[PDB]
Amino acid sequence: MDKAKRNIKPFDGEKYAIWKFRIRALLAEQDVLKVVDGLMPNEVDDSWKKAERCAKSTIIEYLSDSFLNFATSDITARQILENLDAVYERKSLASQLALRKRLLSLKLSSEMSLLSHFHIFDELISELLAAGAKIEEMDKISHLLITLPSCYDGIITAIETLSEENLTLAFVKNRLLDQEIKIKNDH
Amino acid sequence: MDKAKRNIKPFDGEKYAIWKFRIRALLAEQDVLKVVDGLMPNEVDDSWKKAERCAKSTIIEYLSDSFLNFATSDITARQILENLDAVYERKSLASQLALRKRLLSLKLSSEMSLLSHFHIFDELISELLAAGAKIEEMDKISHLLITLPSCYDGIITAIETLSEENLTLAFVKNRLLDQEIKIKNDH
Amino acid sequence: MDKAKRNIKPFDGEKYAIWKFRIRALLAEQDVLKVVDGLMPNEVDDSWKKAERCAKSTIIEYLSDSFLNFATSDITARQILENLDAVYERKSLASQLALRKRLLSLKLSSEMSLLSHFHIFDELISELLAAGAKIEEMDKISHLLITLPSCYDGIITAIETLSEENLTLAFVKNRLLDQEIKIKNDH
Amino acid sequence: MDKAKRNIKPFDGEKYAIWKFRIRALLAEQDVLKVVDGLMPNEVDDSWKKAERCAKSTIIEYLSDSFLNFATSDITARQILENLDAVYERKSLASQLALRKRLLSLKLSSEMSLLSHFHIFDELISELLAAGAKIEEMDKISHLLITLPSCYDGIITAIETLSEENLTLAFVKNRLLDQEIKIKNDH
Amino acid sequence: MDKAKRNIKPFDGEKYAIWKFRIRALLAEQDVLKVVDGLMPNEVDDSWKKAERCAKSTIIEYLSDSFLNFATSDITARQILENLDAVYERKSLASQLALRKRLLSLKLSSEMSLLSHFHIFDELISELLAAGAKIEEMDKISHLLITLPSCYDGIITAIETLSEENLTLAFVKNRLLDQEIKIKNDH
Amino acid sequence: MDKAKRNIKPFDGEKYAIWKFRIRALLAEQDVLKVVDGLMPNEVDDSWKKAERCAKSTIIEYLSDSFLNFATSDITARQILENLDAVYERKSLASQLALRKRLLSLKLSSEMSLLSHFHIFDELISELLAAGAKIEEMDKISHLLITLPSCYDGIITAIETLSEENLTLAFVKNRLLDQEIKIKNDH
Amino acid sequence: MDKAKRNIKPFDGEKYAIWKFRIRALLAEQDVLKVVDGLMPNEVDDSWKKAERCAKSTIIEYLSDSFLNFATSDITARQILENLDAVYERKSLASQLALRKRLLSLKLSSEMSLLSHFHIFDELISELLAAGAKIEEMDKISHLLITLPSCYDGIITAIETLSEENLTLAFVKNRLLDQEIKIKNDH
Amino acid sequence: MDKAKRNIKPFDGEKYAIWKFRIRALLAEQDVLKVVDGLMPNEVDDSWKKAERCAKSTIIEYLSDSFLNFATSDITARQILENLDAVYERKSLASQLALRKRLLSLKLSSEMSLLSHFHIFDELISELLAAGAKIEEMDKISHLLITLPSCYDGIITAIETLSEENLTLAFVKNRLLDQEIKIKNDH
Amino acid sequence: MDKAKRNIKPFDGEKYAIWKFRIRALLAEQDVLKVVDGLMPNEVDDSWKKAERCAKSTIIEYLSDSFLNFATSDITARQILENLDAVYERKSLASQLALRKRLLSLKLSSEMSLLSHFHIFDELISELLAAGAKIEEMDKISHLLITLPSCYDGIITAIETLSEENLTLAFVKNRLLDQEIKIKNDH
């Protein structure tokens, strides 16, 4: 059976925890997830052996060569996950406040290169996926909006109305295009 | 059958309906309002007479010198209310039309704070009601909208793109707070 | 069961959350809050009717003309709650926008007493979450933390790593007070 | 009965009838108005003793210093009131004639607000009722009409051709107020 | 009996009451006053025919030429008199209001004998009684008394000190004659 | 008797003693005066009523119009004359006193006819009697005498201890005219 | 026993008559006066004890510190009354002399409100009685009249005819208010 | 017990005996003074605890924060008061000497009103009693006499011979104030 | 029973230790302190639930806006109070370090009356013990020796003679007040 290649890259970097959590789902349909989760049975069937082989192979496909050194030749998938967890794991503290302190540093930029500001919020989403997970686009759009110039101050808050009912952040970006449109049009 | 101190300043002629329904609610709190509410009761007795006499006493608590002159003991409580109506609340067509003329004329450029204009609209509407006009949410909305300049007119654009059923004059003041909050901050 | 003065004032809709909270505390002390929240009996007895009329009267005492003229004669205090909740507590993102702007408004330099900014922020965020904000407590402190000078850098640059489960509202706020008291003393 | 200060100005001999009427209304709130108005049994049941002395002190609260000695500690509050009635309610041609010219000499200019005119007219009616005589209705009408200023002249000219059922004084007041509105519009 | 010059002024709208009074008296000397004041029986006897026709003829002789229209050769003297009654005695508010306007307008100028002033005053007073407006004894007293200048100050003050039942119109006039004497004397 | 004009005038408030004297004289020669000579008896018959009404009519003929205010419709000619008397005759201490001041002030100058001087004395007498003075024959005489210049002293000497028996005021006028004639020669 | 918020000033040595008398009236309404004044036997029961304590407290809070020495540990309410009456009142003859001198030197300067002078006079009189004088109504009247200025003096000359039995001080004061109003007219 | 406003202050030491005496008087009216000054019943009375706590609260409202820390929650409020009294009001020989020497210095330069320095002398008397040198009538009299100003010392020359039994210090103050009135009368 | 005015501030942390002391005393007055100081009772009957509710509502009466929002109705008023206590009453090492620094820097000053000095010392100590420093009578006295100026050397040595049987801040303060008064006198 071919392993359907995913744009989830072979882990080498941030949150093996989330990456491996999504790998657990990838393991679950072959259910080699069950064998790595499962007690090493008194009866290791050929199915269990094949599942362990497959799991290690999946890990390899999903791990960078530097991490493949931890994989080594035949160390069980479970043992390698444990080693990686032990070395890697800082459990709780860093995750939200890394995003937060980055937002403190990465905010309040209303005028210079609004397209770089597109990239700014893109980095913010990246940081949310990476470390910050508490609240979603309503708060994001709120501070992004506050980040920016006067036109929203007039329109958004009342006049734009419950456009949040649609939550068309796409049209919000298009409103930034409209800012650009007006800027060129006035001259 | 207890009474407490009053935010109501002893009545003087203006906010007559406001003060009057405030007093109505007070009298209903003592249950005594029923005497004015009902037609000639079947239970015309010292207790219903006590209820209306207490009502008269309560009215006299607010009546100032001219009002206390209306408060001749012979006149029934309901009759006194009717007298005060005929002075203040009297439904003159001329009053309604004159107030309509004045509201057309009355406008805000910049010289009245948002709350200043809010109360201006409030008094205008209140008087037009007291003059005996019959008025609806859309009327209040449109007139208040019409009073304003272009910055605020972005709110009118909000109404054209917003369901009028959700619009209420309280909510309109709310939306108008939001609109002038743009001017404050946007400056 | 007391009618003495309160900081409660003929309300304007401004500070509605705490205003209403003090109102509710009062109404429970008036004992009418029980009926105002409690199941309305299918037969609204004079006990319940008294308690409603009393509540409405107290609300009248504590409300301005605007809400009371918005308050129809027959609407129960419940409807008054609902009206004010719709006006204030529709929780459109616009509230969050305004609150984040007011949060941004003061950067707490080394001048102001830190307790001033503590209570300012505390109020601000309390109302922000009263506006339905799904914000984590450390994510609140984070906005205050934006406000601090370089003197703080020595602690803050670590403490941004030392975060929600490690340090919570009290723990961080105390650590911040430790830094600022030391800043003052050192100065 | 706690007597938190009511709508009663103190007393120093001025506008006795009406001020005492405020007192009477208070005594009905005290329920003790029965002691003066109702028969006072010299039995004076204990509730009556307390009521009588309570009334006496209540009056005294509003009484000025001279009025304490006018109200000697022996005479019943009813007797005190009756004494002050003889003292103040000595309705006299001195008062009647002085007031009658003082009032007839006062004129409604076309400037002074017709609201103020109503208060003037009602005051003077009640003054002439109080001073030792009553007033005939058509004479009230006549005096009112005499007060009026020149801008009315055409309207008065029309009015003088209308009989009393055509000129029911309430409608006269109202149509003249509508004429005031017209005049204001013209200005 | 003769048509000896019965020198009434032929009436023209002037002194209608007085004119009609002289006429009534005149006809009574002819005994023909019965033709009108006696609502005639079915007895148009030759005496009554003469009485009526002669009365009519004499009324014409003491009516203005303009007035002969209301006195066409057909109707009986009563009808003519009711015509003029409706002209004057319709309770003309114009007459009443004009009468009081002038009454109130002119103080006693010291250029006229107080007796002449008295006659003038009483005459327009009697005209205002005839004009449809009641006049009270106290009204008459007030008007007369304050229509005078200050030199009266001695009786003016004495009036207040003095009692009501003494100061009748006749007694007031007597005291006014005392003061007239005293004024002429003072010069 | 016929109303052929006697030596009487439409009354003017003046010579009222003489006017009334001649009126009474006419009424008595008409026999009609019996109605004011007698107070209203049980004998109010048709003759009495008609005589009274005719007296009033005749008074009206001899009254000028203002005095018709005394005539006043209904009141008897007896009452009308009583009111007239009170106004002109107007008996009071000050009245005779002021008239006495004038009288002693009086002096004769020859260019004033002695009959001119008679009439000034006689009008003073009319006033003084009408004012209520009980003027003796001797008073009339001596106060007339005081005025006369030295030439009169010859006849005046005929009074000092010489007989008053002849000296009735008619005879005193005879003496006065006698000395006047002597002095007419003398001039 | 409702301790109403009596306007009674916290007294400290000025107009003790007024203060004490108001307090006495309060003791009468408090009903304590019966026990406070009655006697001091061993029948000073729990109600008697609490009544004298209540009165004592009332006195203390309505008095100043000056009394707390006079409060002589535990003198009951009555003993406090006598002590303070002796402290201020003591039938002081020197006070009578000073009060006479003040009153005699005193003159109503017309700008001093008629009320101002009236209470000044009433204060002098009340003090002079407390100083132990045998004052009478005639004294009060005479001094009051004497104390006024020239226009009032002329109207006093009118008032002089009003013999003592005609007059009572309250009535006279009222006539003097009427006279002041007359002066408003007169000027 | 009633909670009516007492003229008693949050206390830090100012007029210690007097403030404490006001407190004591209130507590006696609260009935709680009985335990505060009196017995320590062995039985565990609920009313005793309620009274104590209530009194403590009252005194706390009446105390400054220093006295509150002295007011240890777990001990009787009374004990705290007596302890504070001892600290403040112990028998200091030094205080007595200072009070005597200030009394010598307090030879009054009588710019101050005389009664006021009597009050101040009473304060010093109270202080010297509290300082431990409780004084005797003769001594108080001597000291008071010595303190007075020049013409007052002139009367003291007479006063020296006065009979010692009649010379009660209360009578002395009476006599001195009477002489002050006499001194201003003599001026 | 209902709460009177307590001058206890609508609070925000200023003088929190003693403010909370006053609060706690008021809770004890209501019997509700048992539930606050003790656990929320193991079975919170209506009495205890109402007791804690009353504590909360009174804390609301005495709190200010952010302090009210901290006072959310969910968690017991005692818990909230403790939360705010730890916030301001930060019982952690640096607080006592800073306080010690402040104490050791502080000295008595001449204008700082020894009572005021004691007040300042005592508030410092109250803060220190409230900060949680285990510091007792010997330390209080030792700190007082440290603050005292050169004019206190001899008394300080006398206090060094005063050992643990003598150790009592009251007696110590008493002797220091003796020093102070003798200092005042001497200087």
Side-chain angles (χ1 to χ4, degrees), chain I residues 21-88:
Chain I
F21 194 77
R22 296 176 179 260
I23 291 289
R24 289 157 65 193
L26 171 56
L27 306 197
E29 160 191 345
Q30 298 179 351
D31 309 313
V32 314
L33 187 65
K34 86 178 196 167
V35 303
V36 165
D37 61 28
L39 303 176
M40 171 167 61
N42 305 323
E43 304 76 35
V44 199
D45 66 11
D46 176 34
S47 87
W48 300 340
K49 207 72 166 67
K50 187 175 177 181
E52 184 59 12
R53 282 182 288 183
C54 180
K56 217 165 193 173
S57 68
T58 312
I59 290 153
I60 281 165
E61 181 66 23
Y62 301 112
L63 283 192
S64 67
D65 210 37
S66 57
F67 314 82
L68 301 167
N69 74 33
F70 305 153
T72 54
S73 62
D74 51 355
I75 69 170
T76 69
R78 55 198 297 295
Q79 286 153 333
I80 296 138
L81 287 164
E82 291 167 4
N83 300 131
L84 304 188
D85 299 350
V87 165
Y88 299 115

Side-chain angles (χ1 to χ4, degrees), chain F residues 103-168:
Chain F
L103 175 59
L104 267 69
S105 85
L106 186 63
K107 178 59 78 178
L108 171 58
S109 70
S110 60
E111 68 281 4
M112 174 183 234
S113 170
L114 176 135
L115 279 292
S116 296
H117 193 288
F118 279 12
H119 73 55
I120 176 162
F121 160 82
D122 291 327
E123 64 194 0
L124 289 164
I125 288 304
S126 308
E127 294 166 277
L128 186 50
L129 293 170
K134 305 170 190 172
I135 311 175
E136 302 183 14
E137 181 49 42
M138 198 292 291
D139 299 330
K140 275 153 291 170
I141 294 165
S142 286
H143 300 64
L144 182 45
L145 304 193
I146 200 180
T147 69
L148 316 181
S150 56
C151 45
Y152 297 90
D153 304 348
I155 202 163
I156 293 167
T157 305
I159 306 97
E160 181 186 357
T161 56
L162 272 299
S163 61
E164 263 193 21
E165 73 205 337
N166 311 316
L167 316 189
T168 70

Side-chain angles (χ1 to χ4, degrees), chain F residues 10 89 98 127 181:
Chain F
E89 307 182 353
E127 294 166 277
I181 293 155

Side-chain angles (χ1 to χ4, degrees), chain D residues 137-149:
Chain D
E137 191 74 3
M138 171 174 185
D139 300 338
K140 308 173 199 169
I141 302 175
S142 303
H143 298 129
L144 160 63
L145 294 179
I146 286 155
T147 73
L148 308 179

Side-chain angles (χ1 to χ4, degrees), chain E residues 8-164:
Chain E
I8 311 181
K9 194 203 191 199
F11 172 80
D12 56 357
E14 302 171 17
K15 310 171 182 165
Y16 181 48
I18 315 182
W19 173 90
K20 190 177 184 184
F21 163 62
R22 280 209 184 247
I23 291 279
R24 286 155 45 68
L26 161 62
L27 299 167
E29 299 290 81
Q30 296 80 72
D31 190 53
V32 312
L33 179 60
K34 77 186 188 176
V35 308
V36 173
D37 275 7
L39 191 155
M40 181 189 61
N42 290 281
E43 282 60 27
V44 183
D45 68 0
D46 292 335
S47 190
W48 204 291
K49 295 171 209 176
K50 168 170 178 174
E52 168 44 49
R53 289 181 285 93
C54 183
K56 174 186 188 73
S57 171
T58 307
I59 285 159
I60 286 161
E61 199 70 27
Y62 293 109
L63 280 187
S64 61
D65 53 346
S66 299
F67 292 17
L68 308 194
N69 56 357
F70 290 105
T72 45
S73 66
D74 49 353
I75 57 175
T76 86
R78 73 187 51 258
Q79 288 81 15
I80 308 169
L81 296 159
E82 291 100 37
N83 304 338
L84 299 181
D85 302 343
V87 178
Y88 318 102
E89 311 180 358
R90 60 172 165 97
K91 297 198 173 185
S92 177
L93 275 71
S95 302
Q96 301 152 29
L97 296 181
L99 283 158
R100 276 200 175 140
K101 284 163 216 167
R102 185 169 62 264
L103 172 70
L104 303 174
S105 76
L106 173 57
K107 280 276 209 166
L108 170 68
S109 55
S110 60
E111 302 308 322
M112 168 168 50
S113 85
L114 182 64
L115 191 143
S116 296
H117 170 277
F118 285 176
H119 265 288
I120 295 303
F121 179 95
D122 303 326
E123 282 291 5
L124 87 158
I125 284 284
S126 307
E127 294 160 55
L128 172 66
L129 280 159
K134 176 187 173 187
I135 311 179
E136 194 153 36
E137 182 64 6
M138 180 290 309
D139 301 331
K140 196 170 179 168
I141 290 159
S142 307
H143 289 144
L144 174 53
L145 281 176
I146 314 85
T147 58
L148 315 187
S150 67
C151 38
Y152 303 83
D153 274 325
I155 186 59
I156 287 172
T157 184
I159 283 151
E160 287 218 356
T161 61
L162 290 168
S163 68
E164 308 194 34

Side-chain angles (χ1 to χ4, degrees), chain A residues 92-93 96-97 100 139 142 157, chain C residues 94 100 142 145 161 163 165:
Chain A
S92 46
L93 74 178
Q96 191 74 11
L97 274 65
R100 178 259 155 189
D139 189 77
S142 157
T157 182
Chain C
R100 270 183 158 162
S142 293
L145 290 165
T161 76
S163 64
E165 87 304 337

Side-chain angles (χ1 to χ4, degrees), chain F residues 64-125:
Chain F
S64 75
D65 308 336
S66 308
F67 309 89
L68 313 174
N69 75 351
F70 289 91
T72 287
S73 44
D74 52 291
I75 60 151
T76 62
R78 157 181 287 279
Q79 292 156 267
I80 295 162
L81 284 167
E82 289 156 9
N83 301 137
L84 290 170
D85 299 346
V87 170
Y88 318 106
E89 307 182 353
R90 203 291 186 177
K91 296 190 173 186
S92 65
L93 303 190
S95 310
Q96 312 94 3
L97 293 168
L99 293 173
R100 288 159 181 179
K101 298 171 196 181
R102 293 168 54 196
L103 175 59
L104 267 69
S105 85
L106 186 63
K107 178 59 78 178
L108 171 58
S109 70
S110 60
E111 68 281 4
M112 174 183 234
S113 170
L114 176 135
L115 279 292
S116 296
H117 193 288
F118 279 12
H119 73 55
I120 176 162
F121 160 82
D122 291 327
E123 64 194 0
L124 289 164
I125 288 304

